[PDB]
């Protein structure tokens, strides 16, 4: 029973639930379903639900997900990838959405910035959510985890040295693999904003656009003000409110 | 959306749903949540939702699950174990129950016979469902599967280490489960079901060293429909008082 | 070098060769290639090359193969199946034929009786030899090995009790599996004789015909005099000389 | 029939054949039989028959083999190991050599560099080819493969036990080989090829406890084409006197 999944935490009036390691907020509404994914917080800061304020006064159904809870010593998530390096966490998110949402999937919108944008893409491309509106995702996920936390990277690489570089490249290509194996016949509605001052994620955006190009999948991209900062976020929020 | 998960099949007036290859019936009631798991049908017979007749005229919330849809050559299920031999299928079942149930887990009852009883044990021990009322479950899964289908076991094998991993898959659940849960496990078995009486003693040994005391009962019949008749009377008696 | 593969044995003037555990005779000729497989000899009798006499005065190319050399305590062969229960022995036979034969495959003819007929079928259906002319093959190979040698069966079943019945049914269906996975688009030229007094192998022939029927593969079958004996063989030899 | 095995490809006037997915060149000569094995080409380059230029103007019998045709994503070969990780491919090579060679095995010479040298060792140690003249072979196969292609290693893995089985696949050949054969194994390695000098010491340790004394020689270069130049001079010197 949903109410028995509560953690005791409360975010802006919304009670937190946890199912099979997946923490989420749920507000039942009408017309549309809005789904958000959390990005990396700073070290020693708890993972935060993204873009609640934009939607708690809305009448839409709202689900906001956090990343995983491991590793314990730097519990800022593993890019929505299980420690078995598979889809078990994305699958849990998918089940929660399909059972708690009261709209069609084409009336479902996936939102997220940076790591959250990758999460939205990973879920949408695995389980055919066509509406993905994100900002500045990474392309090579392991290269980026390395810059944010050596602890999270080391944990995800595993303990055996035989497989560390294997796991590294596997994680590094996890999203790119999702693009290559996704259903090219779906009417994808993917928008990716990026700050014009964000040289890194501008390059990552070219890598992603290239993979979508190879799959004959047209993507909408819009450059916006800012870098990897709150000015880009501010323009991103304005962008996805216009669409939705 | 749940209504978008309908397969178009209807079983006894109950619509069928499917999420992540997991097919289930769902009927919202009150008071209690009853969960059933499918057992092995005969070789060329489709998988059946078990004990639906016992609970269509009841006011309880009811969920009946089928096993997996593979292998295609013999689609009778892989003991609720994925092709990767992990918890992926039990994960989906757990998510379906937790989000569709309108009762507490202590008011939830897992039911099943033979392979259906293993499924109930696999789910309950993994995700702390205390009420498990089953009949004649197997303990060594691969040993039983090969007597029912060489096709399914070989598909699940992908050879030696896989055999032991499947064979002990339920015993490992017992070894791993939460000893401090107030377990309410009832296991019946036919008087004449010698194979599964021994299987029950193998399961009891694992429960025993985990300090889990289960309830058992001999009923008439073998590994047959006579036993299932008395099993059904047993779980109706337990659930209603 | 072929001459360095000799065993020192000599059968009717033909020197025996052995390559990777596979014993064979080879006489180079013209026009056609004749390939024979050995059947079960009696216990404590060496495996025999089949139908040499019919072809040593012929001008055709001739290859005669024996079964495997294991188990050591009853070395009468394992139905041309390796002790890993795979195609490694058939593959060796195929290589020898493709390298020593000087005709096309449709001018190649596979001959054999009983166990040898199964060998011919196993090779022909794995590697697309269309001309197969055999007598009284078995259908359920393990059931038949059980009647001939408990020692060979036990050896092929392996040592671990977990897999004995698995291996039994696997061997029992080895030829039937070959029929189901064979190329149905090949112009098969398969003739199967059987003695009218051979109730057992008449039933096995119905099982085989059924599998060929399911694959939409037409087979020629002819009932001949005798049982599982030298009268059936005698009529079988006459039959395959008429075709070739 | 051999002529029916032609692929239709021609390499430097030599027709290509294929038997059981094994692609080879064959040129009948006299006196000696020279066997070469292909090494890893770059990522998007087709597999090459090695050292064909050294032996087209020679009167020797010549066979050059490629590695396997899988995986399709990166078809540079699986170290002459089948997808089932067994001797199936070396079996076919052995059959081709034994039936097409017109010289004794003591007049047969296996050649190859890097992965090509492993292939020569795998064949020679399995089927008692005494003359092996190679450059800079690897000893831990999986450790090297992953630095050249994550795609090929993962295909070969199908994970942990497979890694060790592949990594030690050549070392097990040494452990299993015939100690009483009059082995004639020459292994060269570039002065500056530190990785493979250490790899050679790992191979030497296995030969050592099998009472097999090999011949080794430092040549100039690293794991590069400078070393291959001196390797080629070395095997021409050995073969001709
Ligand atoms: Cl981030
Ligand atoms: Cl069952
Ligand atoms: Cl026989
Ligand atoms: Cl190489
Ligand atoms: Gd435009
Ligand atoms: Gd513009
Ligand atoms: Gd007619
Ligand atoms: Gd007629």
Residue numbers in the entry:
A (entry chain B), C (entry chain B): 1 to 244
B (entry chain A), D (entry chain A): 1 to 158, 164 to 246
List sentences quoted exactly from the publication behind this structure:
The key enzyme is the O-acetyltransferase CsaC (MynC) encoded in region A of the CPS gene cluster. Our structural analysis of CsaC identified the capsule O-acetyltransferase of NmA as an α/β-fold enzyme with Ser-His-Asp triad. Each protomer consists of a central eight-stranded β-sheet that is sandwiched by six α-helices and capped by a lid area formed by helices α5, α6, and α7. A deep positively charged groove, which traverses the protein surface, allows substrate binding and opens into an active site that is characterized by a catalytic triad composed of S114, H228 and D198.
Consistent with the oligomeric state of CsaC in solution, the crystal packing of all CsaC structures contains a tetrameric assembly with two protein molecules in the asymmetric unit.
